[PDB]
Amino acid sequence: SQIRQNYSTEVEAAVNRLVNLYLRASYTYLSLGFYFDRDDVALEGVCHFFRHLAEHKREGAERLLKMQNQRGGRALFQDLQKPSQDEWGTTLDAMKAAIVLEKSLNQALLDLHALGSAQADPHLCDFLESHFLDEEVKLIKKMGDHLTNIQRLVGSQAGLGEYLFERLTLKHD
Template sequence: MTTAPPSQVRQNYHQDLEAAVNHQINLELYASYVYLSMSYYFNRDDVALKDFAKYFLHQSHEEREHAEKLMKLQNQRGGRVFLQDIQKPDHDDWESGLNAMQCSLLELHKLATDKNDPHLCDFIETHYLNEQVKSIKELGSACILGFPLPFL
């Protein structure tokens, strides 16, 4: 089996970062898969929590978009996208899987900082970390104050 030649647009993109971005892509797809499972659980006729179903479906779409942004970044930087198997969601332990994904973003940011890659640091901050803070605040306000979420 022959390997593909290195990309002609690859510039200043460390292999460790390429591997970490591929890992993050897998985690984003996993999160999308978990949210999709949760959405259709809450949409069942015996559960019938339609607003929860809408919320988690929206989150599933957002996580898939995150994965797609990372794939686009990988191509722009001259890296290669290597998709991996997506782990089956464990419906008894939703929190730990999503928490792991959030921690992974921080690790990816730290690795990008260590490898002196300001472009990747900025990308992660702009498209992921700030959005997570906003989503947590939005969901918390809606739950505490009874405000509707913008997509419900």
């Protein structure tokens, strides 16, 4: 490569794996979004919350792919596994599955940062710090806040709580 400098094969490979993890996450959120649009689920604010995350995770994958080319690495795509579930349960089940998914993406980012640190690759380390690590902390804090509110609302009338959370906390229209 005419441009590649200080870019390890180990980072190049890990970036291709992280692209696969982000695209899998996007696909998971696409499935969650359409599940909440079902006529027998019908929680618009929950649908919009997950559809937006599907778009955001796709954008993350595209930013990693642009950076791979900027550093002179080569994008390599793999099979994308289907989401872990076909039906996602309650808003609470779905938000618990989301925070697990985000913790797994966050650990993949921290692992890649640690590899870049070990490889003395400060451009890679800056890149994750600037575009991913704080977006992930912010998102996990928001999901933690939502879990608390959902849990408060279950009480002895789960249906009423699920409706009120979607109407008064999540964005709809």
